[PDB]
Structure 1
Amino acid sequence: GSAFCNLRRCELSCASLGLLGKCIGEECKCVPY
């Protein structure tokens, strides 16, 4: 595809829980660090 997910759009959304995020295409996943 020509377009992909933003890292802030996962790192902020996982910081709402209290941890870091990483994003693949559109799917955001949270990690402890």
Structure 2
Amino acid sequence: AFCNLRRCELSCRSLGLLGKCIGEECKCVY
């Protein structure tokens, strides 16, 4: 099961920040 990092970056760009895949899950960081 991929954490889909290139889909994560989009979802964090809606906040205005980068997406990181860590512990098999997408999370955004300021």
Where on the TM-score scale, by shorter chain, does this alignment land: which range?
0.5 to 0.7
TM-score by length of 2: 0.59
More helix by share: 2
Structure 1 spans left out of the alignment, 5+ residues: none
Structure 2 spans left out of the alignment, 5+ residues: none
Give 1 or 2 for the bigger CA radius of gyration.
1
TM-score by length of 1: 0.57
Backbone CA RMSD of aligned residues: 2.1
Deviation >4 Å, runs of 4+? none
Q: Give the number of aligned pairs.
A: 30
- Percent identity between the aligned chains? 97
